[PDB]
Short mmCIF file of N, CA, C and O and ligand atoms in Angstrom, two decimals:
data_model
loop_
_atom_site.label_atom_id
_atom_site.label_comp_id
_atom_site.label_asym_id
_atom_site.label_seq_id
_atom_site.Cartn_x
_atom_site.Cartn_y
_atom_site.Cartn_z
N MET A 1 41.43 1.17 -13.05
CA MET A 1 40.34 0.05 -13.41
C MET A 1 40.28 0.13 -14.95
O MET A 1 39.39 0.53 -15.58
N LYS A 2 41.45 -0.71 -15.49
CA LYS A 2 41.62 -0.55 -16.94
C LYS A 2 41.98 -1.94 -17.11
O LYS A 2 42.55 -2.48 -16.39
N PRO A 3 41.71 -2.75 -18.36
CA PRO A 3 42.14 -3.76 -18.60
C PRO A 3 43.81 -3.68 -18.69
O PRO A 3 44.50 -2.55 -18.99
N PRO A 4 44.27 -4.92 -18.51
CA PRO A 4 45.86 -4.94 -18.58
C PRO A 4 46.90 -4.55 -19.66
O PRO A 4 48.04 -4.22 -19.71
N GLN A 5 45.89 -4.82 -20.84
CA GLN A 5 46.60 -4.67 -22.16
C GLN A 5 46.77 -3.18 -22.70
O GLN A 5 47.59 -2.81 -23.55
N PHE A 6 46.17 -2.48 -21.84
CA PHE A 6 46.31 -0.80 -22.07
C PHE A 6 47.12 0.06 -21.07
O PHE A 6 47.15 -0.43 -20.01
N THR A 7 47.85 0.91 -21.71
CA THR A 7 48.65 1.95 -20.92
C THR A 7 47.82 2.86 -20.41
O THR A 7 46.58 2.73 -21.07
N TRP A 8 47.66 3.70 -19.44
CA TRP A 8 46.99 4.75 -19.16
C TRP A 8 46.46 5.50 -20.45
O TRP A 8 45.39 5.99 -20.23
N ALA A 9 47.44 5.99 -20.98
CA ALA A 9 47.13 6.82 -22.32
C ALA A 9 46.19 6.03 -23.31
O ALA A 9 45.30 6.84 -23.77
N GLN A 10 46.66 4.78 -23.34
CA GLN A 10 45.73 4.09 -24.41
C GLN A 10 44.32 3.77 -23.93
O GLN A 10 43.47 3.85 -24.60
N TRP A 11 44.14 3.55 -22.49
CA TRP A 11 42.91 3.66 -21.92
C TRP A 11 42.08 4.82 -22.18
O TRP A 11 40.90 4.98 -22.23
N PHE A 12 42.80 6.26 -21.93
CA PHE A 12 42.21 7.23 -21.99
C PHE A 12 41.74 7.49 -23.26
O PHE A 12 40.69 7.90 -23.62
N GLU A 13 42.39 7.15 -24.41
CA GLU A 13 41.87 7.22 -25.63
C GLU A 13 40.71 6.35 -25.99
O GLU A 13 39.94 6.89 -26.77
N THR A 14 40.58 5.24 -25.43
CA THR A 14 39.62 4.50 -25.58
C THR A 14 38.34 4.86 -24.76
O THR A 14 37.39 4.57 -25.41
N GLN A 15 38.73 5.37 -23.57
CA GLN A 15 37.26 6.17 -22.90
C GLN A 15 36.73 7.43 -23.18
O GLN A 15 35.72 7.64 -23.33
N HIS A 16 37.72 8.47 -23.50
CA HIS A 16 37.48 9.77 -23.81
C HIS A 16 37.75 10.36 -25.18
O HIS A 16 37.61 11.39 -25.59
N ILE A 17 38.29 9.38 -26.33
CA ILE A 17 38.79 9.94 -27.54
C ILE A 17 38.08 9.23 -28.48
O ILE A 17 37.50 10.01 -29.53
N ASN A 18 38.25 8.02 -28.52
CA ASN A 18 37.83 7.18 -29.76
C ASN A 18 36.36 6.71 -29.53
O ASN A 18 36.04 5.57 -29.04
N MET A 19 35.49 7.82 -29.68
CA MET A 19 34.15 7.19 -29.84
C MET A 19 33.47 6.41 -31.13
O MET A 19 33.39 6.98 -32.14
N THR A 20 33.68 5.13 -30.84
CA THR A 20 33.52 4.12 -31.94
C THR A 20 32.00 4.24 -32.74
O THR A 20 32.05 3.65 -33.87
N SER A 21 31.25 4.97 -32.16
CA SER A 21 29.91 5.27 -32.93
C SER A 21 29.53 6.60 -32.19
O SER A 21 29.77 6.96 -30.94
N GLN A 22 28.76 7.39 -32.83
CA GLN A 22 28.14 8.74 -32.60
C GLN A 22 27.00 8.56 -31.45
O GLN A 22 26.57 9.25 -30.68
N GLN A 23 26.53 7.18 -31.26
CA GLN A 23 25.63 6.62 -30.43
C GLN A 23 26.18 6.20 -29.26
O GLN A 23 26.98 5.21 -29.18
N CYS A 24 25.73 6.70 -28.07
CA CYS A 24 26.49 6.21 -26.72
C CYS A 24 26.25 5.01 -26.45
O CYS A 24 27.28 4.10 -25.82
N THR A 25 25.16 4.31 -26.80
CA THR A 25 24.93 2.89 -26.42
C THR A 25 26.03 2.04 -26.89
O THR A 25 26.48 1.07 -26.32
N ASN A 26 26.32 2.27 -28.31
CA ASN A 26 27.40 1.42 -28.91
C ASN A 26 28.64 1.69 -28.57
O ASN A 26 29.44 0.78 -28.56
N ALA A 27 28.77 3.28 -28.42
CA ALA A 27 30.27 3.65 -28.21
C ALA A 27 30.56 2.99 -26.71
O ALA A 27 31.60 2.48 -26.56
N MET A 28 29.73 2.82 -25.90
CA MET A 28 29.80 2.53 -24.47
C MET A 28 30.13 1.13 -24.30
O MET A 28 30.69 0.36 -23.38
N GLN A 29 29.68 0.10 -25.37
CA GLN A 29 29.81 -1.42 -25.23
C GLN A 29 31.24 -1.75 -25.47
O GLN A 29 31.85 -2.49 -24.45
N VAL A 30 32.15 -0.73 -25.91
CA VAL A 30 33.73 -1.00 -26.00
C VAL A 30 34.17 -0.67 -24.65
O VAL A 30 34.89 -1.74 -24.21
N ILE A 31 33.76 0.22 -24.04
CA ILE A 31 34.30 0.49 -22.61
C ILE A 31 33.83 -0.35 -21.47
O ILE A 31 34.75 -1.05 -20.76
N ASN A 32 32.70 -0.84 -21.64
CA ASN A 32 31.98 -1.86 -20.84
C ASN A 32 32.34 -3.26 -20.79
O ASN A 32 32.48 -3.94 -20.05
N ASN A 33 32.53 -3.62 -22.19
CA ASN A 33 33.31 -4.97 -22.55
C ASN A 33 34.46 -5.00 -21.92
O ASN A 33 34.99 -6.19 -21.74
N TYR A 34 35.23 -3.81 -21.97
CA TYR A 34 36.69 -4.02 -21.59
C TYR A 34 36.74 -4.01 -19.95
O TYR A 34 37.42 -4.82 -19.41
N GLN A 35 35.96 -3.27 -19.27
CA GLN A 35 36.16 -3.21 -18.04
C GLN A 35 35.04 -3.95 -17.06
O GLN A 35 35.12 -3.88 -15.87
N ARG A 36 34.20 -4.97 -17.66
CA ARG A 36 33.27 -5.86 -17.18
C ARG A 36 32.27 -5.27 -16.21
O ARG A 36 32.07 -5.65 -15.23
N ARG A 37 31.65 -4.25 -16.76
CA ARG A 37 30.71 -3.43 -15.99
C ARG A 37 29.98 -2.19 -16.74
O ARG A 37 30.87 -1.83 -17.47
N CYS A 38 28.90 -1.80 -16.61
CA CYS A 38 28.37 -0.89 -17.37
C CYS A 38 28.55 0.42 -16.65
O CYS A 38 28.02 0.81 -15.59
N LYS A 39 29.66 1.22 -17.09
CA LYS A 39 29.94 2.55 -16.39
C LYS A 39 28.67 3.40 -16.30
O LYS A 39 28.01 3.44 -17.32
N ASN A 40 28.51 4.07 -15.29
CA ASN A 40 27.33 4.84 -15.24
C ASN A 40 27.43 6.23 -15.94
O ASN A 40 26.57 6.77 -16.51
N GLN A 41 28.64 6.79 -15.90
CA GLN A 41 28.89 8.25 -16.67
C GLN A 41 30.18 8.14 -17.65
O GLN A 41 31.19 7.74 -16.95
N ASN A 42 30.21 8.68 -18.40
CA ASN A 42 31.40 8.76 -19.56
C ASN A 42 31.51 9.74 -20.53
O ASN A 42 30.45 9.70 -21.33
N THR A 43 32.21 10.62 -20.63
CA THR A 43 32.49 11.78 -21.59
C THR A 43 33.40 11.46 -22.65
O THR A 43 34.54 11.04 -22.46
N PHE A 44 32.99 11.63 -23.89
CA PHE A 44 33.87 11.46 -25.20
C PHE A 44 34.12 12.89 -25.81
O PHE A 44 33.18 13.73 -25.87
N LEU A 45 35.61 13.31 -25.74
CA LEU A 45 35.93 14.46 -26.08
C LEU A 45 35.94 14.63 -27.64
O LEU A 45 36.62 13.76 -28.22
N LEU A 46 35.19 15.47 -28.32
CA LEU A 46 35.26 15.42 -29.87
C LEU A 46 36.52 16.26 -30.25
O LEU A 46 36.38 17.32 -30.89
N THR A 47 37.66 15.60 -30.23
CA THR A 47 38.96 16.48 -30.36
C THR A 47 39.81 15.05 -30.93
O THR A 47 39.60 14.05 -30.58
N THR A 48 41.17 15.59 -31.25
CA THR A 48 42.07 14.68 -31.49
C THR A 48 43.06 14.19 -30.31
O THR A 48 43.15 15.22 -29.39
N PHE A 49 43.58 13.10 -30.43
CA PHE A 49 44.73 12.79 -29.59
C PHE A 49 45.84 13.80 -29.45
O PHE A 49 46.14 14.02 -28.32
N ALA A 50 46.24 14.12 -30.70
CA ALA A 50 47.22 15.07 -30.96
C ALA A 50 46.90 16.24 -29.95
O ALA A 50 47.73 17.10 -29.49
N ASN A 51 45.75 16.89 -30.22
CA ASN A 51 45.18 18.17 -29.61
C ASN A 51 45.07 17.88 -28.04
O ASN A 51 45.61 18.94 -27.38
N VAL A 52 44.72 16.83 -27.38
CA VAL A 52 44.84 16.63 -26.05
C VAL A 52 46.54 16.62 -25.51
O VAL A 52 46.60 17.16 -24.36
N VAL A 53 47.14 15.83 -26.14
CA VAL A 53 48.67 15.90 -25.92
C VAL A 53 49.14 17.35 -25.77
O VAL A 53 49.97 17.66 -24.94
N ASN A 54 48.65 18.14 -26.65
CA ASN A 54 49.06 19.53 -26.70
C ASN A 54 48.68 20.38 -25.48
O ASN A 54 49.22 21.29 -24.78
N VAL A 55 47.40 19.99 -24.83
CA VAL A 55 46.74 20.75 -24.01
C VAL A 55 47.67 20.15 -22.70
O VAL A 55 47.75 20.96 -21.66
N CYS A 56 48.15 19.10 -22.72
CA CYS A 56 49.34 18.58 -21.55
C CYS A 56 50.32 19.57 -21.53
O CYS A 56 51.07 19.50 -20.46
N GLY A 57 50.49 20.27 -22.55
CA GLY A 57 51.49 21.14 -22.62
C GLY A 57 51.43 22.43 -21.97
O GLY A 57 52.08 23.43 -21.94
N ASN A 58 49.98 22.66 -21.51
CA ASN A 58 49.43 23.82 -20.92
C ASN A 58 49.85 23.90 -19.64
O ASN A 58 50.24 22.93 -19.01
N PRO A 59 50.01 24.87 -18.98
CA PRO A 59 50.37 25.23 -17.55
C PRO A 59 49.77 24.06 -16.59
O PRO A 59 48.63 23.79 -16.75
N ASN A 60 50.59 23.50 -15.76
CA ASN A 60 50.05 22.69 -14.87
C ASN A 60 49.12 23.32 -13.94
O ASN A 60 49.48 24.39 -13.56
N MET A 61 48.05 22.76 -13.36
CA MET A 61 47.14 23.29 -12.29
C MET A 61 46.69 21.90 -11.55
O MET A 61 46.84 21.07 -11.79
N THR A 62 46.13 22.56 -10.59
CA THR A 62 45.53 21.47 -9.48
C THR A 62 44.34 20.88 -10.01
O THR A 62 43.34 21.41 -10.75
N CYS A 63 44.37 19.61 -9.76
CA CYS A 63 43.21 18.64 -10.48
C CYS A 63 41.94 18.90 -9.60
O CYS A 63 41.96 18.48 -8.55
N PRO A 64 40.88 19.35 -10.36
CA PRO A 64 39.61 19.67 -9.62
C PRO A 64 39.16 18.28 -8.78
O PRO A 64 38.63 18.51 -7.47
N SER A 65 39.19 17.16 -9.48
CA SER A 65 38.73 15.99 -8.63
C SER A 65 39.78 15.61 -7.56
O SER A 65 39.53 14.89 -6.55
N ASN A 66 41.08 15.85 -7.58
CA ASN A 66 41.98 15.62 -6.48
C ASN A 66 42.97 16.85 -6.02
O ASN A 66 43.79 17.17 -6.92
N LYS A 67 42.78 17.31 -5.26
CA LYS A 67 43.59 18.61 -4.68
C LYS A 67 44.75 18.34 -4.32
O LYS A 67 45.78 19.14 -4.28
N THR A 68 45.25 17.10 -4.15
CA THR A 68 46.74 16.59 -3.98
C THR A 68 47.43 16.66 -5.13
O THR A 68 48.60 16.37 -5.23
N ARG A 69 46.86 16.58 -6.47
CA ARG A 69 47.41 16.65 -7.59
C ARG A 69 47.74 17.72 -8.53
O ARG A 69 46.72 18.62 -8.50
N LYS A 70 48.66 17.94 -8.99
CA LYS A 70 49.15 18.98 -9.90
C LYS A 70 49.47 18.78 -11.29
O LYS A 70 50.28 19.33 -11.78
N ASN A 71 49.06 17.54 -11.56
CA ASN A 71 49.32 17.15 -13.06
C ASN A 71 48.19 17.35 -14.11
O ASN A 71 48.11 16.62 -15.17
N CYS A 72 47.53 18.19 -13.64
CA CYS A 72 46.30 18.42 -14.59
C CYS A 72 46.50 19.62 -15.38
O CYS A 72 47.37 20.47 -15.20
N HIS A 73 45.79 19.70 -16.57
CA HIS A 73 45.84 20.84 -17.41
C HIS A 73 44.52 21.33 -18.05
O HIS A 73 43.75 20.44 -18.51
N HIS A 74 44.30 22.44 -18.13
CA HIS A 74 43.00 23.03 -18.87
C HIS A 74 43.16 23.43 -20.31
O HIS A 74 44.39 23.77 -20.76
N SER A 75 42.21 22.92 -21.13
CA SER A 75 42.17 22.90 -22.47
C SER A 75 42.23 24.56 -23.13
O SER A 75 42.69 24.54 -23.94
N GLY A 76 41.72 25.22 -22.31
CA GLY A 76 42.14 26.83 -22.89
C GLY A 76 41.02 27.20 -23.85
O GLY A 76 40.68 28.17 -24.05
N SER A 77 40.43 26.13 -24.66
CA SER A 77 39.52 26.34 -25.68
C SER A 77 38.39 25.40 -25.31
O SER A 77 38.48 24.27 -25.04
N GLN A 78 37.10 25.83 -25.87
CA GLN A 78 35.99 24.67 -25.56
C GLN A 78 35.80 23.77 -26.84
O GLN A 78 36.25 24.06 -27.93
N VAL A 79 35.41 22.47 -26.29
CA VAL A 79 35.44 21.57 -27.34
C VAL A 79 34.18 20.84 -27.48
O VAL A 79 33.54 20.91 -26.30
N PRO A 80 33.55 20.25 -28.63
CA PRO A 80 32.24 19.66 -28.56
C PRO A 80 32.55 18.48 -27.85
O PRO A 80 33.69 17.95 -27.97
N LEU A 81 31.66 17.83 -27.35
CA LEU A 81 31.89 16.64 -26.53
C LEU A 81 30.41 15.89 -26.42
O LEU A 81 29.40 16.46 -26.64
N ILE A 82 30.45 14.60 -26.06
CA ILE A 82 29.25 13.87 -25.71
C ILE A 82 29.28 13.21 -24.65
O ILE A 82 30.27 12.34 -24.14
N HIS A 83 28.33 13.61 -23.72
CA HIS A 83 28.25 12.83 -22.48
C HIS A 83 27.45 11.60 -22.59
O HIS A 83 26.17 11.79 -22.61
N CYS A 84 27.82 10.20 -21.85
CA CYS A 84 26.95 9.24 -21.85
C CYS A 84 26.54 8.88 -20.75
O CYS A 84 27.36 9.00 -19.63
N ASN A 85 25.11 8.84 -20.47
CA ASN A 85 24.63 8.54 -19.29
C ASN A 85 23.92 7.07 -19.27
O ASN A 85 22.83 6.81 -19.98
N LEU A 86 24.33 6.36 -18.19
CA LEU A 86 23.57 5.07 -18.15
C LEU A 86 22.01 5.09 -17.95
O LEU A 86 21.55 5.58 -16.96
N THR A 87 21.24 4.43 -19.08
CA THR A 87 19.71 4.63 -18.86
C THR A 87 19.09 3.15 -18.52
O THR A 87 18.15 3.07 -17.79
N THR A 88 19.66 1.95 -19.03
CA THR A 88 19.27 0.84 -18.82
C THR A 88 20.32 -0.15 -18.48
O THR A 88 21.17 -0.64 -19.07
N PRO A 89 20.51 -0.35 -17.09
CA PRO A 89 21.68 -1.28 -16.39
C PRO A 89 21.46 -2.71 -16.51
O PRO A 89 20.18 -3.15 -16.29
N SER A 90 22.34 -3.68 -16.62
CA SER A 90 22.19 -5.06 -16.88
C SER A 90 23.71 -5.80 -16.16
O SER A 90 24.60 -6.17 -17.10
N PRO A 91 23.66 -5.67 -15.08
CA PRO A 91 24.99 -6.23 -14.14
C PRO A 91 25.17 -7.82 -14.74
O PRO A 91 26.21 -8.30 -14.29
N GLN A 92 24.05 -8.42 -15.10
CA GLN A 92 24.36 -9.80 -15.81
C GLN A 92 24.60 -9.90 -17.35
O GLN A 92 24.77 -11.08 -17.66
N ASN A 93 24.31 -8.81 -18.02
CA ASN A 93 24.51 -8.89 -19.43
C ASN A 93 24.92 -7.51 -20.09
O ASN A 93 24.03 -6.65 -20.44
N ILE A 94 26.10 -7.06 -19.92
CA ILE A 94 26.73 -5.70 -20.20
C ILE A 94 26.40 -5.31 -21.59
O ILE A 94 26.04 -4.05 -21.69
N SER A 95 26.44 -6.07 -22.58
CA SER A 95 26.13 -5.83 -24.12
C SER A 95 24.74 -5.37 -24.08
O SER A 95 24.35 -4.41 -25.20
N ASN A 96 23.92 -5.43 -23.05
CA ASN A 96 22.52 -4.75 -23.13
C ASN A 96 22.07 -3.54 -22.34
O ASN A 96 21.06 -2.84 -22.75
N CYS A 97 23.23 -3.07 -21.74
CA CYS A 97 23.28 -1.79 -21.22
C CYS A 97 22.95 -0.55 -22.25
O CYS A 97 23.58 -0.70 -23.42
N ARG A 98 22.09 0.24 -22.13
CA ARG A 98 21.60 1.27 -22.98
C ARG A 98 22.02 2.73 -22.16
O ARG A 98 22.12 2.69 -21.15
N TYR A 99 22.24 3.61 -23.16
CA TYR A 99 22.78 4.94 -22.60
C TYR A 99 21.92 6.18 -23.35
O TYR A 99 21.57 6.07 -24.53
N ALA A 100 22.16 7.21 -22.72
CA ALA A 100 21.72 8.39 -23.39
C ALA A 100 22.90 9.17 -23.95
O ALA A 100 23.79 8.86 -23.28
N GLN A 101 22.47 10.21 -24.73
CA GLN A 101 23.79 10.92 -25.11
C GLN A 101 23.63 12.42 -24.95
O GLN A 101 22.32 12.83 -25.46
N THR A 102 24.41 13.35 -24.43
CA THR A 102 24.16 14.38 -24.20
C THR A 102 25.20 15.51 -24.81
O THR A 102 26.19 15.43 -24.24
N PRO A 103 24.84 16.14 -25.69
CA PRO A 103 25.96 17.02 -26.78
C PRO A 103 26.26 18.23 -25.77
O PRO A 103 25.19 18.79 -25.51
N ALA A 104 27.41 18.77 -25.82
CA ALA A 104 27.74 20.06 -25.19
C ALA A 104 29.05 20.48 -25.75
O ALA A 104 29.73 20.01 -26.47
N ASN A 105 29.33 21.77 -25.37
CA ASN A 105 30.66 22.38 -25.79
C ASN A 105 31.23 22.85 -24.60
O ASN A 105 30.54 23.78 -23.95
N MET A 106 32.33 22.40 -23.99
CA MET A 106 32.89 22.69 -22.73
C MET A 106 34.32 22.56 -22.77
O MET A 106 34.78 21.95 -23.89
N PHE A 107 35.04 23.11 -21.43
CA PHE A 107 36.28 23.09 -21.62
C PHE A 107 36.70 21.66 -20.75
O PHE A 107 35.71 20.99 -20.33
N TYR A 108 37.73 21.34 -20.88
CA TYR A 108 38.06 20.00 -20.24
C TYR A 108 39.51 20.14 -19.43
O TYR A 108 40.33 20.96 -19.90
N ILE A 109 39.73 19.34 -18.48
CA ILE A 109 40.86 19.49 -17.73
C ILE A 109 41.20 17.93 -17.53
O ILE A 109 40.57 17.01 -17.34
N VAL A 110 42.69 17.69 -18.17
CA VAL A 110 43.11 16.44 -18.21
C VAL A 110 44.35 16.33 -17.53
O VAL A 110 44.97 17.31 -17.15
N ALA A 111 44.51 15.21 -16.94
CA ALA A 111 45.91 14.92 -16.01
C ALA A 111 46.76 14.15 -17.10
O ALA A 111 46.24 13.25 -17.61
N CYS A 112 47.96 14.56 -17.05
CA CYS A 112 48.85 14.16 -18.13
C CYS A 112 50.12 13.44 -17.33
O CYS A 112 50.47 14.19 -16.14
N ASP A 113 50.75 12.56 -17.62
CA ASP A 113 52.00 11.89 -17.16
C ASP A 113 52.98 11.44 -18.37
O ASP A 113 52.54 11.57 -19.37
N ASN A 114 54.34 11.11 -17.84
CA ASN A 114 55.10 10.92 -18.82
C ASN A 114 54.65 9.41 -19.35
O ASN A 114 53.93 8.66 -18.64
N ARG A 115 54.93 9.08 -20.52
CA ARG A 115 54.52 7.83 -21.21
C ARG A 115 54.90 6.46 -20.44
O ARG A 115 55.96 6.62 -19.77
N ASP A 116 54.19 5.33 -20.60
CA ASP A 116 54.61 4.25 -20.36
C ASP A 116 56.01 3.84 -21.10
O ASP A 116 55.83 3.63 -22.27
N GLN A 117 57.12 3.82 -20.38
CA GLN A 117 58.23 3.43 -21.05
C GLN A 117 58.29 2.43 -22.07
O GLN A 117 58.64 2.41 -23.06
N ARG A 118 57.65 1.29 -21.39
CA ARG A 118 57.70 -0.06 -22.12
C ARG A 118 56.60 -0.20 -23.50
O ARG A 118 56.87 -0.83 -24.42
N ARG A 119 55.30 0.36 -23.07
CA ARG A 119 54.40 0.07 -24.23
C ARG A 119 53.66 1.40 -24.92
O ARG A 119 53.09 1.06 -25.98
N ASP A 120 54.01 2.40 -24.31
CA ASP A 120 53.65 3.78 -25.05
C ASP A 120 54.43 4.04 -26.14
O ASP A 120 55.72 4.24 -25.92
N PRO A 121 54.13 4.48 -27.34
CA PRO A 121 54.88 4.99 -28.52
C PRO A 121 55.86 6.19 -27.79
O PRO A 121 55.36 7.08 -27.24
N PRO A 122 57.12 6.07 -28.26
CA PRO A 122 58.05 6.99 -28.08
C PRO A 122 57.73 8.50 -28.61
O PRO A 122 58.20 9.46 -28.21
N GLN A 123 56.75 8.49 -29.74
CA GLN A 123 56.26 9.74 -30.36
C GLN A 123 55.80 10.90 -29.31
O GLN A 123 55.95 12.00 -29.58
N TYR A 124 55.16 10.24 -28.48
CA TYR A 124 54.55 11.30 -27.53
C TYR A 124 55.07 10.90 -25.97
O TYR A 124 54.54 10.09 -25.12
N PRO A 125 56.20 11.76 -25.76
CA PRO A 125 56.81 11.45 -24.24
C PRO A 125 55.71 11.79 -23.14
O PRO A 125 55.63 11.26 -22.09
N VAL A 126 54.85 12.99 -23.34
CA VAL A 126 53.71 13.20 -22.37
C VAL A 126 52.48 12.80 -22.98
O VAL A 126 52.09 13.07 -24.16
N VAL A 127 51.70 12.00 -22.08
CA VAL A 127 50.27 11.63 -22.62
C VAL A 127 49.27 11.89 -21.48
O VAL A 127 49.46 11.93 -20.21
N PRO A 128 47.89 12.02 -22.11
CA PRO A 128 46.91 12.27 -21.18
C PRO A 128 46.58 11.06 -20.55
O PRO A 128 46.53 9.82 -21.30
N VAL A 129 46.40 10.89 -19.19
CA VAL A 129 45.98 9.54 -18.41
C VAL A 129 44.69 9.74 -17.71
O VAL A 129 44.23 8.31 -17.48
N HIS A 130 44.00 10.68 -17.47
CA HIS A 130 42.82 10.94 -17.05
C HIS A 130 42.08 12.02 -17.23
O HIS A 130 42.58 13.23 -17.56
N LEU A 131 40.64 11.90 -17.41
CA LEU A 131 39.91 13.23 -17.60
C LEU A 131 39.30 13.67 -16.54
O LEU A 131 38.53 12.97 -15.86
N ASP A 132 39.88 14.42 -15.84
CA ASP A 132 39.46 15.17 -14.61
C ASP A 132 37.88 15.79 -14.32
O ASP A 132 37.35 15.34 -13.55
N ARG A 133 37.87 16.63 -15.47
CA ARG A 133 36.60 17.48 -15.46
C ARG A 133 36.33 17.86 -16.87
O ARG A 133 37.25 18.32 -17.70
N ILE A 134 35.05 18.30 -17.11
CA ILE A 134 34.45 18.95 -18.06
C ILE A 134 33.83 20.25 -17.42
O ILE A 134 32.86 19.87 -16.39
N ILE A 135 34.29 21.50 -17.81
CA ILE A 135 33.68 22.72 -17.04
C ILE A 135 32.76 23.32 -18.01
O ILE A 135 31.80 24.05 -17.61
N1 A3P B 1 45.81 13.46 -11.11
C1 A3P B 1 45.47 12.44 -11.66
N2 A3P B 1 46.65 11.94 -12.30
C2 A3P B 1 46.71 10.60 -12.94
N3 A3P B 1 45.96 9.66 -12.93
C3 A3P B 1 44.54 10.12 -12.22
C4 A3P B 1 44.41 11.66 -11.52
N4 A3P B 1 43.29 11.51 -10.92
C5 A3P B 1 42.73 10.47 -11.17
N5 A3P B 1 43.38 9.62 -11.89
C6 A3P B 1 42.98 8.19 -12.15
O1 A3P B 1 43.25 8.02 -13.59
C7 A3P B 1 42.55 6.92 -14.15
C8 A3P B 1 41.90 7.74 -15.44
O2 A3P B 1 40.61 7.33 -15.70
P1 A3P B 1 39.40 8.45 -16.04
O3 A3P B 1 39.74 9.14 -17.15
O4 A3P B 1 38.08 7.42 -16.04
O5 A3P B 1 39.28 9.24 -14.70
C9 A3P B 1 41.34 6.69 -12.97
O6 A3P B 1 41.70 5.59 -12.30
P2 A3P B 1 41.04 4.10 -12.40
O7 A3P B 1 40.93 4.21 -13.91
O8 A3P B 1 42.46 3.38 -11.83
O9 A3P B 1 39.99 4.18 -11.58
C10 A3P B 1 41.44 7.84 -12.11
O10 A3P B 1 40.72 7.97 -10.94
#
C-alpha cells in the first residue's frame, strides 16, 4: 500500500528514513496524506539511506514478520529511532490525526531487494523495501 509514484525503496525512505519533522504528528501527515489513511503505528530510523543500504549487505536472515522470507537483514548496531503511535484518529479528515512519539535505541531488521530497474537510481543496485522489525 504505497502510492504509484514511488518504488518500494522510495516508499521505504518516505516511511522510515525521511522524518520531515521531529514531531510525529507532522511527520505522519506525509505518510497519511500519501496512503489516504492515518497509519496506526510507524517507526522512523534515525539513520541514513546509505547506512540502511549497507545493512542490506549484511547476511541474509529470515524475516521475523514472514517465516517464508529470506530477504531480511539485521543492522548489527543499535540506532536511535522514533516510534509514532496514533493518538487521535480521523477517518474523515487525515490531516487532523495526532500522534505520540516514543524515542528509543534498537536494532532493526530490513528486507532488501534488487532496485526497481525503471525508476530506482542505478547508484544503488540493492535497496531496503520494508522495515520488518525493531528489536
Ligand atoms: N520479506 C519481505 N520482502 C519485501 N517486502 C516485504 C517483506 N515482508 C513484508 N513486505 C512488504 O513490503 C512493504 C513495506 O512496508 P513496511 O516497511 O511498512 O512494511 C509492505 O507491504 P504493503 O506496503 O504492500 O502493505 C510489507 O508488508
